[PDB]
Amino acid sequence: EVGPKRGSLVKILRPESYWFNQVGKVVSVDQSGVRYPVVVRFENQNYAGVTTNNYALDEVVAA
Amino acid sequence: RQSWLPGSQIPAHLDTPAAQALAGNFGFDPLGLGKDPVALRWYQQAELIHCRTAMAGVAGILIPGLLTKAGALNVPEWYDAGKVAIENSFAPWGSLLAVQLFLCGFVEAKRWQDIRKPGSQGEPGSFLGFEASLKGTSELGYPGGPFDPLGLSKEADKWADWKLKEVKNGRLAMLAFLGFVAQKYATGAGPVDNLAAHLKDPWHVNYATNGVSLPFL
Amino acid sequence: LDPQIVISGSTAAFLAIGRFVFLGYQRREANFDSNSTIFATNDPAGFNIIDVAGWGALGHAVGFAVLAINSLQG
Amino acid sequence: KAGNWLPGSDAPAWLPDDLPGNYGFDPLSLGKEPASLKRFTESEVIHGRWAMLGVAGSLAVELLGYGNWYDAPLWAVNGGKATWFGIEVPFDLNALLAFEFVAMAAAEGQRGDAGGVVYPGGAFDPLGFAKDSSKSGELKLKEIKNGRLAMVAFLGFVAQHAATGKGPIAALGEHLANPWGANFATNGISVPFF
Amino acid sequence: KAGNWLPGSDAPAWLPDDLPGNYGFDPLSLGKEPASLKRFTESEVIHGRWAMLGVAGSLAVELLGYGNWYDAPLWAVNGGKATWFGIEVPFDLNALLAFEFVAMAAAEGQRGDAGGVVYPGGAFDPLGFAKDSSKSGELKLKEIKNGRLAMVAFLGFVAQHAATGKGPIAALGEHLANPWGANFATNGISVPFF
Amino acid sequence: DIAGLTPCSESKAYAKLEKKELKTLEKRLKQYEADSAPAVALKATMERTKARFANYAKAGLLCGNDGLPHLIADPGLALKYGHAGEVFIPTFGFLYVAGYIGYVGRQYLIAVKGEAKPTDKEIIIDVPLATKLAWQGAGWPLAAVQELQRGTLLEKEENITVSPR
């Protein structure tokens, strides 16, 4: 139950991330004590062609 | 529901109850300039001012021009009346335009502030007691008080009809003045002269024979 | 134009405005401006030798500018 | 408040009600900061007083008959002597700059050292017309209104002179002789397309 | 109420019955608010008194053979001296504007400082013609009616002068001599087509 | 007049250049027949040259020492000496057409951005939507001013990606 709801839209707060200040869909949130449990999928790929990434609880905000 | 094009899809922004309350609503907006309600309200005020100004100007051009055709008056053409009037005048056109700009700017600024805030011109102790009469009615662009001295706007039964007679006529006047300009650049004579020339021979005196409106023919 | 009178008057005037008019403002601005030698003087208002040199320099520049302009005859 | 500069418009929240001459006129929001507004108040009062004295002097010289305000310093540029009220002044331009510089430096230095005092009182008010602060609010409004009017008048003096070459009294008489034919719209300088 | 301006019409609810000269005439609803009605009432009484003085002066000056009301200030346009009842006055136009301005400013300031008083009494009524408030309402009606008639008469004076060129007494004699041949319809500007 | 230039209707170098162009065209025409295709084409070119020179002189253009027309870009000088047709009116004409194109493109992007696959609409143009927006773009200045006044023309700073500084 920790973290954002699955399927919701969040804004990335990681400064070095390609999707900084961008909206992405929440895929899954790990229930353990991992550093980056939130899984976010994006519509636009980065320079490496990846569309998903892992972020911490404080690195994503419900937007 | 009267429409400007039977069968055409009327825009959704012109079908709302607020937009349908405007006079002369025929669903005519192909460019979609009135999609924004604030923009629609501003354009409604602009259309009302244009209607009244065009009606006054077209009347001042047509009635003296029609009386000049007969022996009632001797008013010159509208495109030449400015020079004739400024010749035997007490002031040059620049000084007159400056005084006009100041006098018009005062009332236009008051109307602008009323558009931004309806009824805001009724601030007590601001216009020597005349501010009580400067508050418009519930409809923007339709004030009472000093305006409308006959009180013909108090009767609601004819109110909706009266507005329909003001916008439509105004729209016609807006086109009339436009024609007055185009004809001046296509025939070189006044509107009454063009009307008489066309009535004398309509099958040969029209815009298809002036050599300007149809450059490919 | 007497050069001595003009120079003496300009220097005395600048020293007077620096000792009785702008001394408090200068002291307030110098303290708020934040190895050294303390030029302590017996002047009751703290007007030291450095202030004398600065105000005298300004007075001399003003006096020589006035003398120069008057010498140009215009 | 003294009134409303725009009837029907909301007054700015940064303008206090007890401030004299508060008409709510601040479209550019220059006095939004409280520190800037404090300096602007004394600056406006000082400007109004200086403009009142300047306009009064400019009108007095032309009314009495000693030229206009623009032709007054013309004696110091090409072999002349200053004449106050028709009496020859025994001071040249070199002595005037020293006296004025020292006097103004001392007076303005004391005023600056005071700490932004707008209404000193005491020695500056020997008649005691503002001894009580209750009635001083109405008298301050008259001072700020006359100051703003005098500032506008001095700006008009400079503009009308730069556009025509005549003094304020001479321009007034010309306008009275021909209002429609002699104004800012007929000088050929203000509006270039008229 | 004094009467009905439009027979068959209902009097407005914002006009008090005890108001002098209340005929229920307010189609534009100008005096709808009570604050505006007070100022307009005082303004109407002042206008009526000034109009009565003006019309009486114009009629007397043209009936005594000292010119009409329009040619009275013509002496200060081409050079001359003003004459009152045939007696020369040595005051030029410049000294008249200053004295009139000072006197009118002082009198009007004293009148306005009372808070908009329409019927002061006391020093202004040394004969005591309105000592009792019972007969005060009747005389007030006569004053407002005579003032309204004087205002209409002055407007007629200005309009008939701008339309013909002659004075009020000269226009009355011309109309008495030829009523059908001399009226507003024969001046040439009131009716354009005819 | 302006900048020491002279009107093209009075410039001697302008008429000299016109004579030179007509002279070389006539010289080339002298080698052909009188009722052939090259003769007719050369005569048409000569008439076009004469009409162009007369139209440029009639327009009131200013010519320099070289006899060539010079344009006035200052709005004050152009409006004061009747040169607004050189650089002023074409300026506003370009601004209208350029803003027209930009507004139509922006409207198309905003319209297709709310679909399932906006990139597909970007490579395969939706002709009906593009035609409708192209026709509706005639009121682009009014619509743009309204969008700017409502605050919907720009995007917030928090919704735009930036580098880590």
Side-chain angles (χ1 to χ4, degrees), chain D residues 23-149:
Chain D
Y23 284 96
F25 175 67
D26 203 8
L28 295 187
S29 308
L30 305 185
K32 201 182 165 197
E33 308 301 316
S36 292
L37 181 68
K38 168 167 165 55
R39 176 176 177 82
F40 286 156
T41 296
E42 56 160 326
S43 182
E44 185 189 4
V45 170
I46 288 287
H47 280 95
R49 288 160 174 179
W50 274 120
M52 276 187 274
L53 280 181
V55 166
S58 314
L59 282 174
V61 54
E62 206 160 354
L63 275 189
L64 283 165
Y66 307 111
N68 49 58
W69 64 275
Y70 190 85
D71 296 345
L74 267 181
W75 64 271
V77 289
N78 52 2
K81 295 205 97 83
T83 57
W84 191 65
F85 274 94
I87 316 171
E88 174 193 345
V89 168
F91 291 123
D92 58 316
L93 184 56
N94 292 293
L96 295 183
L97 293 183
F99 272 118
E100 170 175 344
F101 174 75
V102 167
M104 289 314 294
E108 293 287 325
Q110 298 262 62
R111 183 173 77 78
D113 277 335
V117 178
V118 190
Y119 307 108
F124 294 94
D125 197 16
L127 305 186
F129 281 165
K131 187 62 71 72
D132 46 322
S133 195
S134 84
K135 217 192 199 183
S136 71
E138 194 262 345
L139 293 174
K140 282 159 185 178
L141 171 63
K142 292 180 163 169
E143 182 198 33
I144 197 70
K145 260 156 98 179
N146 281 265
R148 289 156 177 185
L149 178 77

Side-chain angles (χ1 to χ4, degrees), chain F residues 75-149:
Chain F
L77 291 154
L79 289 173
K80 197 181 169 192
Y81 301 106
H83 297 287
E86 308 164 5
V87 182
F88 202 60
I89 301 151
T91 291
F92 294 132
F94 177 79
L95 284 185
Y96 180 75
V97 189
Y100 194 97
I101 296 157
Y103 202 79
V104 163
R106 169 171 194 266
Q107 286 322 290
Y108 184 82
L109 286 182
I110 293 169
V112 307
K113 257 181 215 172
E115 295 181 8
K117 295 208 81 66
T119 58
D120 278 2
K121 289 295 194 72
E122 286 194 347
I123 47 156
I124 302 172
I125 302 305
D126 187 19
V127 183
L129 173 67
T131 315
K132 176 194 63 158
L133 290 167
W135 276 119
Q136 286 203 323
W140 86 263
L142 280 74
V145 160
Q146 288 309 310
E147 266 201 38
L148 168 61
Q149 278 154 354

Side-chain angles (χ1 to χ4, degrees), chain B residues 67 128-130 132-133 145-146 149, chain E residues 27-30 33 36 39-40 193:
Chain B
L67 290 188
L128 308 168
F130 205 68
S133 312
Chain E
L28 268 62
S29 316
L30 301 191
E33 281 287 328
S36 297
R39 175 193 169 80
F40 293 160
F193 314 126

